[PDB]
């Protein structure tokens, strides 16, 4: 009668950067299924009545103006280059303002995001590569120069920023139902 480890995901003291978003695989357990809460392809009042093959718990941090991108069929720097959800996504997205946890007076430059990438991310793709991005014709060869920039930047979360620039911790729960046996049942 194992209980699903949701406490470890929502109540984690430190969250991952959006470009290196974390995923917790949850299986073979019983779950008791100012917050941004949007579900897609499935109703929340029905999750306690459904069993799934696997439930994937994706967690990361973005800024407030970027939470609208964590959704199916969305475009933008976060959706295309950091964390993409498929068009037929079945699950829920949860976000809450974490300005009291992830913002420092001198600036919390620890949280990063990808700015440049040659192509768009596939659904659920995680790219932690930090190779010098070639924006021109000449080969960069790991040289930060003209048309050769570093692909990651910092959020620099400060408490004096506006809500659109304040940190938001995001937890994306994917509900998978392939073949296999259904082990994650709500109760």
């Amino acid at each position: 009668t194992n209980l699903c480890p949701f406490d470890e995901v929502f109540n984690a003291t430190r969250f991952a950067s959006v470009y290196a978003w974390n995923r917790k695989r949850i299986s073979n357990c019983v779950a008791d299924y100012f917050f941004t809460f949007k579900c897609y392809g499935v109703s929340p009042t029905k999750l306690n009545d459904l069993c799934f093959t696997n439930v994937y718990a994706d967690s990361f941090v973005i800024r407030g103006d970027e939470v609208r991108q964590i959704a199916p069929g969305q475009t933008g720097n976060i959706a295309d280059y950091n964390y993409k959800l498929p068009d037929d996504f079945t699950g829920c997205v949860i976000a809450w303002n974490s300005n009291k946890l992830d913002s420092k007076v001198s600036g919390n430059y620890n949280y990063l995001y990808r700015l440049f990438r040659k192509s768009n991310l596939k659904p659920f793709e995680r790219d932690i590569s930090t190779e010098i991005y070639q924006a021109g014709n000449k080969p960069c060869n790991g040289v930060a120069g003209f048309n050769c920039y570093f692909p990651l930047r910092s959020y620099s979360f400060r408490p004096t920023y506006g809500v659109g620039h304040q940190p938001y911790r995001v937890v994306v729960l994917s509900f998978e139902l392939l073949h296999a046996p259904a082990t994650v049942c709500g109760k």
Partner: antibody
Amino acid sequence: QVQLQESGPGLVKPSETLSLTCTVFGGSITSSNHYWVWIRQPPGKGLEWIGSMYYSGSTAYNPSLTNRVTISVDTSKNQFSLKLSSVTAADTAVYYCARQIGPKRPSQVADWFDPWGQGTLVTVSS
Amino acid sequence: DIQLTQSPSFLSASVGDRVTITCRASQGISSYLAWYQQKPGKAPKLLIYAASTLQSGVPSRFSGSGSGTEFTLTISSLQPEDFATYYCQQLNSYPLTFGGGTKVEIR
């Protein structure tokens, strides 16, 4: 019109702990766009920034004051305080509390001080 | 640590004279500078912020200008009440730092 009224003992023996309090008038201390700061001025010398604080807890201290500086906020009394431990004669100064405006956007010009407390001289002596 | 160097340390001008005070930063801080006026026994009073924006309630004879490393505070017509020590402050980087001050004597 926001006002700051500081108070506290003007005499602290060496190795003891300095303690000062600032009471905000004409405005709440739970300001979402301001920091609450302390600044000191040794007699005949310039100004040295001690630290800044957001009402919800976060602080920024001057690395020149090592780990002997603590600022705190009492939202229920509209006050914020300063505690400087292990004081020496080099800590004898007029201490001011002040209000610092914080930025609302990344790379916005802020971080100036207005208004100020009237200043309290603290003399480190036995 | 950003260091601010204020020149001169002292100056003595007549009433009606045009006074100019310089503040030079050890690095370029764009327009992240403020000016303060401190009269004897009083807390410093904000005069200019963002290098050139005059604070509401400051006489128009005060003005700031500059960008990058060198900034100037100008009193177009010095008055007897303008006797004070003026400080610059950088507002770009932590820790927050002030200049050494320019004591302005008056006749």
